[PDB]
Design a protein around this nucleic acid. Structure first.
Ligand SMILES: [Zn+2]
Length: 58
DNA sequence: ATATCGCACGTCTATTATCCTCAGCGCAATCAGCTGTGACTACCT
């Protein structure tokens, strides 16, 4: 069981946990604004992040 | 002997499913910075 950091309700499997190891249930999944997904190139341009920093930094 | 049916000879029209120019992401062309070799030119105390 995984405890959600937003609502506190324990959940077993969720989309956020499965795809990004984020301890948040689908009920609290704010994919609109808080959990918005962006392309790799856009993130690299905005945050000046390199490939290694996105793949090799623990 | 003269109109009439079978045969042929085409020709107009169509009851109906094709080829062009705009989009992220990763490997390669590009560039600033630094240095190495050689001789040159000069400048201060
Ligand atoms: Zn939750």
């Amino acid at each position: 069981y995984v405890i959600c950091e937003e609502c506190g309700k324990e959940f077993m499997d969720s989309y956020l946990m499965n795809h990004f190891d984020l301890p948040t249930c689908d009920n609290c999944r704010d994919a609109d604004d808080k959990h918005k997904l962006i392309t790799k190139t856009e993130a690299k341009q905005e945050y000046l992040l390199k490939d290694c920093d996105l793949e090799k930094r623990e």
